[PDB]
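Quick one before lunch.
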Amino acid sequence: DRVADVIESSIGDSVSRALTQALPAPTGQNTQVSSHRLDTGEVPALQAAEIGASSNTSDESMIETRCVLNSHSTAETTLDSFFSRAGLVGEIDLPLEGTTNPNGYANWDIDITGYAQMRRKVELFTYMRFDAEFTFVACTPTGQVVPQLLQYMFVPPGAPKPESRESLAWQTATNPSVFVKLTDPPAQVSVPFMSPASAYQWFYDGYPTFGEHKQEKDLEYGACPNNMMGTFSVRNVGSSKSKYPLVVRIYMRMKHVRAWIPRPMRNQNYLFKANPNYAGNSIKPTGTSRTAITTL
Amino acid sequence: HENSNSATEGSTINYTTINYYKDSYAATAGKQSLKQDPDKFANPVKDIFTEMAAPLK
Amino acid sequence: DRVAQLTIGNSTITTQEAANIIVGYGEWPSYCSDDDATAVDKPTRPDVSVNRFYTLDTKLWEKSSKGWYWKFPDVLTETGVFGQNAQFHYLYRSGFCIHVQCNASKFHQGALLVAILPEYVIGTVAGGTGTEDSHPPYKQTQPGADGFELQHPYVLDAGIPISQLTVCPHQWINLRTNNCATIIVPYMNTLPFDSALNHCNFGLLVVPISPLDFDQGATPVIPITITLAPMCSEFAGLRQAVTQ
Amino acid sequence: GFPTEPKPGTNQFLTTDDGVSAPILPNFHPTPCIHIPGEVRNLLELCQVETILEVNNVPTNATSLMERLRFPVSAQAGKGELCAVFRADPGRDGPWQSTMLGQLCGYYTQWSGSLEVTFMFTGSFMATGKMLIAYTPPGGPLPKDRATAMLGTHVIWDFGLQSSVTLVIPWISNTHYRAHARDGVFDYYTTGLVSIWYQTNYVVPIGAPNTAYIIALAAAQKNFTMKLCKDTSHILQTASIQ
Ligand SMILES: CCCCCCCCCCCCC/C=C\[C@H](O)[C@H](N)CO
Ligand SMILES: [Cl-]
Ligand code: NA
Ligand code: NA
Ligand code: NA
Ligand code: NA
Ligand code: NA
Ligand code: NA
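Model of the sodium ion complex:
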């Protein structure tokens, strides 16, 4: 009734065959007693790195070990323990006089790739899914706390970005906004995972649009819109110039973190936001160097 | 009850969190299950071999 | 365990000096679940006509070679029926079986690191000084089947250490031990399907960590050939053929 | 209202405090999570993956950076000559800085557990030889000769079909955990020293290279653990990132 290669066919299997399983490991593995072993045929110490797998040799087979009941916790190395720590990811200036946002408002493009510490950590993984907690610390350039009322507004991509302090966009009929005084403790808020993808990508090896990819448009290489969450806008809630110069530091704490595919950790200094460019004339070694290989 | 909109919804891992709002992505990070899968990166070989054996036979 | 045969489609690979097989992240390629999918149109699963071994260009290993790389969905977009489907369809999905082969003699020596780096984004030297925001050209980000040579292998042309590249599915070709590396990669991306033209899921890196060497008289031409086969290929969103 | 009394710590913003925060988007539901390969659950999963250890961290030249990834071995004079040496300290400036383990350590103040270093010989099939890799626990000064190095934990490696050998640096410490070792007072947490010696000699026939290289790969054992998060010693940035 039906061709055999179609019946016995396996095209369509949606379940991923996994060769490994995640086991409970709340503490470091214990060490078991070991005695001398003088025999042929069994060679724990000999490996073959070509295979691409790490050595499975254990302490017990290399030396005579005692019994150690290891009760050291492995909890502080979970993804949440590692990433759930607020760090600086943005900094906005609202000076009185200058060429940088001198009209009492600013539009910060949401990108946590502007600061090395936070950036290097997250770039340890290729993909990451998480909720976050944003905290906004505001004050003057001297650290002085001033009696000023500010308005922070999240402008998702597509919404109208304010063009002035008195822009109509500040009506926030739908965008989420926060009104705080610099005298109040830093505003804090919870953000969900808002990407149209299943996770954010710190690395996107491709282009966002089709067509010819000429020199002028190489600016778009590695730009993934699934990571472009919109803009963060700030302003003096008023219609006149503020009496003080302001600064807003943005901190981010990740929660409910999932991460996939680890990568080599940043080796060279960061230069730009949208890419991994490095100074070709100042390529420094990963670490420290010495005089001779036979001397410390 | 409460909205199930946290980033870890439908994950094969248990969490103990605290919350005061209807949206669960606002909950604390909480504590989590300590499962690990070293072999996934350290021994992703098709035909596994013992440590007592000579890798290449 | 040193010998092996890989048969898929109408192609067969043989080897008598292998070093087992690596299955990237401990997962075999599979088709897309009905709950992981979004595109509502029924996909095409050409099977045998696209899931077979394609042998791309050969490279010459010199005592001074730095290394090469190939972006993957890409290397095949202009070859066989796989390429045609990748051009006619908007969405593509698939795993790969990569087999890098390179043989010498019992008197030659050297070691190649063969690794798979997902989302392998290329960076530039930034004009040397690091003040110029330059970007890699299309010819370098998506080199095609001819692959591309690394200018600064130590940092993988992306500011990251090659010494840690082993956290990725890899294998070595140590001439005194084996003459080929086999790595099976599942479909990895944050989406169930994606464009085979605009996006390159991962990159294949073949880099000499221990320089090739031999005494004058032994054959000096030592090639490195790349053979690869798609697995569980699925395409959707049919239209006219698009090259890029 | 209900009688309350705010205590010290009121209004403070503790970077690592794990509390609740008002959600900005009511009833928002995230994109479903597809299945993605290579998911990580704990960083210790990465500390067990071997990465190249730069034992030959000597060349700093622009063109010679790729040679820090492997060190030479060659025909000698047969007097148990020294090949290479390096500290076993994971979170210390030196060879371990090139490894993933060394990098992840930088993010933790303390660690505990056995370490392992696998050496892969990349000479020719016709090349033979036996080496003696020794690990000298704390207090033991850099062994002056092989006869002194062999008094500590060691392994005699014989080159053959199995290209590699694994030196296990057993956890031999006085304290349960070790903080990162540095010069001076914190050298209290030193792990010891590793040194490769020629057990016999690198022998080869006519027609085969007189010099071959060894590649060292390092990682942690199953009993390895880390605690007390901190920032890495280095920040890869000089001026603002544009
Ligand atoms: C007053 C309300 C303010 C609300 C602010 C909400 C901010 C939500 C930020 C989500 C940020 C996700 C960042 C993830 C990825 C990076 O943007 C990309 N890797 C940059 O290339
Ligand atoms: Cl240390
Ligand atoms: Na699947
Ligand atoms: Na073994
Ligand atoms: Na091990
Ligand atoms: Na235990
Ligand atoms: Na306006
Ligand atoms: Na709060």
